[PDB]
Design a protein around this nucleic acid. Sequence first.
RNA 1: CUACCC
RNA 2: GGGUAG
Length: 1203
Amino acid sequence: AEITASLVKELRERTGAGMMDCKKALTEANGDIELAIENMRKSGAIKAAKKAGNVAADGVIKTKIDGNYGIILEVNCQTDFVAKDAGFQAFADKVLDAAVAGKITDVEVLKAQFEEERVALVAKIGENINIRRVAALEGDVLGSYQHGARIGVLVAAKGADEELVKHIAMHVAASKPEFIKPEDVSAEVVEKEYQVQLDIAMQSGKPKEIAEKMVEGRMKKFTGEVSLTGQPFVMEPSKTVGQLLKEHNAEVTGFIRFEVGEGIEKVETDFAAEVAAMSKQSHMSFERTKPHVNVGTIGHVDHGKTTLTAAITTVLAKTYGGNTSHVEYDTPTRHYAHVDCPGHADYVKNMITGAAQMDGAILVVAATDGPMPQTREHILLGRQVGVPYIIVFLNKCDMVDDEELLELVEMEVRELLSQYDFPGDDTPIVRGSALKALEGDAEWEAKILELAGFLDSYIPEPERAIDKPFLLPIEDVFSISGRGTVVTGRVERGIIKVGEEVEIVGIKETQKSTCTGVEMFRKLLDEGRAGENVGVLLRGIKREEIERGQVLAKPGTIKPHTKFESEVYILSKDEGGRHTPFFKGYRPQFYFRTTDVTGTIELPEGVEMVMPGDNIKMVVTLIHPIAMDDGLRFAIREGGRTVGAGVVAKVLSGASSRNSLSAQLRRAANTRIEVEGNLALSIANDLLLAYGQSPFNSEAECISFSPRFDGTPDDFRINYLKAEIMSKYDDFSLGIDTEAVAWEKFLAAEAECALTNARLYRPDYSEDFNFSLGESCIHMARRKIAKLIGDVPSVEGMLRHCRFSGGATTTNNRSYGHPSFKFALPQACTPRALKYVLALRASTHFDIRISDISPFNKAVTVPKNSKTDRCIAIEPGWNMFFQLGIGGILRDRLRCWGIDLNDQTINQRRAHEGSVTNNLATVDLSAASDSISLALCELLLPPGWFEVLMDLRSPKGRLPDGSVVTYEKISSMGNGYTFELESLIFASLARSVCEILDLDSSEVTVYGDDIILPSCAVPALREVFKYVGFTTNTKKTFSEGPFRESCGKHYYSGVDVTPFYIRHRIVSPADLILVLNNLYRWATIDGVWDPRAHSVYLKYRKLLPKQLQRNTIPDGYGDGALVGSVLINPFAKNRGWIRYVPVITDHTRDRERAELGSYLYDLFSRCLSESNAIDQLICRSNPTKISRSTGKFDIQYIACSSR
RNA sequence: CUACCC
RNA sequence: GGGUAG
Ligand SMILES: Nc1ncnc2c1ncn2[C@@H]1O[C@H](COP(=O)(O)OP(=O)(O)OP(=O)(O)O)[C@@H](O)[C@H]1O
Ligand SMILES: [Ca+2]
Ligand SMILES: [Ca+2]
């Protein structure tokens, strides 16, 4: 207690300065008003000077006009909550009508014209509130569109009005150009990349007018990009903006554009990581059913929320026990989750996207300075995002020496909540100190315990998903004979006992039905708990009247609507979302629960444009109803990819393309073109002359030309494609070639495998003198294997890796290949493998069928090269089921040696390095899987595994030749585990070749046979392989060359020399659309052609039908049309503010699916699920339908994008 | 169901 | 068979 706290508020609501900074400036003023504020005047600029270490990121932008005189601004702070308040506005605006009176176009002028006032806010707020930049533009006619407050633009035209100047200002605000025309270039900034890319190109070995033409062409695009001229006008992007003016009378002069916090940079701060350090300095001085509550900390930046959250961490660790960027502190009764919410806009991208919803936020306010002017925006953020309960806490209460003064700070927060319809009179307010609590002051540590004691009561217990009224999203439908109709999908909320009545609501009049039975895979239970994958039976209702996306809920719990209001976040350019904004008639599909549903929207009053990376309110009105209530996390699919997300906010009352064109295209799509002889050979020959290289003369040289390994990377890249492009051309006329040669090698695949299987059974050679290198690695391999593998494949990882998948089995064929035609049909087992199948029968109540039991598998031949074929082996369906099982555990486990099989990036990436480093060598064996003998497989594997590999393998096979064979090879190609085993075998050996030669085994990577190791180890590894059966492919193992290849990426001195093969006889336009495309990608860098190859491209582009030349799609979307600039495409229909394009699609007539097998497969998937920006967890797998490939070509419409 | 590939 | 984009 000092002087009276009465007229200290007189020093507040006459100034607005800090709480204690009044009384302390009043104690040094001797009970006077004036001279106290005269202190604050000078001792407030000192504080303003302290604001230099406060980096300002947020801000506003302001614009204003008079006649035809425009002006922009960039006055900015460091928080959203400030910029949106009625205070930063009163200042920012007032310094923008100061630029109207006088054309103040010099930042330094107005920066000082308001300095005595600029401090009057920071003393009242406490942020580095400083004006940044200002500029004005004059011209004939000038308009200005402003995006909310984040971006403002000024553009001056000539022949235009609000119908135009606003629209292109919307383009300046959207497409962000830096110049007006391709002419606006400093020759220095141009001859920068004209000289910097010359090296790029000339180093590769491109003649003058190649590299020059390419670079000029690329920079012609590079300049074209920033060119406001050549830039697809945002509103109608078919045409460039420069094209719009010429078509329009008009001609713009110039343009100004500001985005807040542009070039500000600085370093991003993460709340969660930091508090770990706030806690650390203070450190050194059963019941898992407890509810989860999402709390958040909201308040001033300098009021130390981050100090409080540390106290609520460490003091909560002193008693009971202690999305990223959130802490996870506990309490005796509950389990919390505590986020920091500093950005208004970057919290709506958390409530909406659901990355961090809210169950009740905590209101941190320093008691030394009371509530700040921007507190009414914090509290606003609460009652505008729908936070249930707000808990207030006075931080730093020791700085007040009078409780009569502290009581009066409550009057400034209790009434600040009453204005925002919060229980101000009945809200909890803890007066404490966090900094004191970080120390050991338990007198103050009771305050954190007082606050933490209020989350335990004031905040309501979250209705555990079990207790919420029943609901199950229908994910699929099956009509089983003897089961009526069953639907599946993980039940979202509630319990379903068998017999209870439910409602099927989705699109049709909501129908009602009783639950006959609820079941899983292994169990056929009776009650269905929430958050479990099940299948519920329905009586008196069949398949025809249950669509997907429908829900299966308790009657009268959830109603179907089609017109609601909602808020959505749009994914930015750097989030996969559309790198183009959209306007009024945006028509996407709203992916709800399981199904997708199209529909229109609208904008709330006054917004006309929304960009990628925005929050926005809207009124969604979809096509046909879906069952809903507020809180449905719905995403926003555009053509199968999601570009938005959102939550339904409140639900309301409820309520161009050329078809002829696609039919024209479809007709030409089926047009079979015709060529005088071999088209491919001509395309490839006429391509060789495009490169100076000598063309093929006969049809033999297509697969007998050996490329030289020297010259520029250009002298190689094309000389290499020559040798490779033809290789797989199956239709070779005078080819005396066969598929029988494939069998001839398969003979040696066992003949070699026999000679090794036999000889690899005598570890003692004759006596004890000699010591071989092969045996040595085997010994080491063997020990290495088992430390990584185990004694026997645990049934834990056995059952939950086995799966029915692929196509062909000895029982089935390519037609009956889907996983549903495996549960439906009786698949064949094998003598030893029976015991497993029986276990599966004992694993469930469903039917497990074995037709024959035989130890045979069909040996066939799949097309491979033009000089040879393959010899894959079709395995029995039950062996394959378990083979894929072990291959999944023997895969995941093979990741500890750093080998990733479902990511072959990490193997062609190291083929890159080796093409330069010359230390990494790529190795290819000759017949990988077929050369792996039973002998070697036996010596290495643990005998437990070596049995699980002997039970599941097919020991005998039957050829087309009638003749049978017993497999010397432990397993052939097509076998359900061989790929993993061969990877592990080779990797095992490769590592043993490393440690034996004093070298890192962790420098070894193996992808099947595509193995990569230290170059030194090569002659050892090669001699190891000579022993252990295998044989290296001199032609495809590279150790000393400038060239390396791996996982289908070839490299020459770090340059990309990946060729492309011409495969089947080119005939239908589909085959030529594709070929042109590969040659497009192989010869282009960002829409810029290699001129030489561009000739034969345009030349054979003529071969295609008329319409089938102007039909282009951006690369990455397939080969349904030629790849080109889609901005061009005539066919491209702009529907619903989204570009739609027609492309060639293989035509299919549907076939009836095995309802039995598909259902059994559907609940088998939901057993392998259970035992196994940040929101693709709103999506799931598709239902089962079979479609036979006809022969026709249909045309499907898809979604596309710019670049 | 369509490219690429071990 | 298997990876990987549609
Ligand atoms: N249809 C297939 N079924 C099973 N495995 C296959 C198939 N196609 C390729 N592979 C796998 O790719 C690996 C590498 O194949 P690669 O193309 O090197 O043929 P290779 O059989 O190893 O001998 P070659 O060098 O003579 O082709 C093989 O070990 C094999 O396991
Ligand atoms: Ca090989
Ligand atoms: Ca290989």
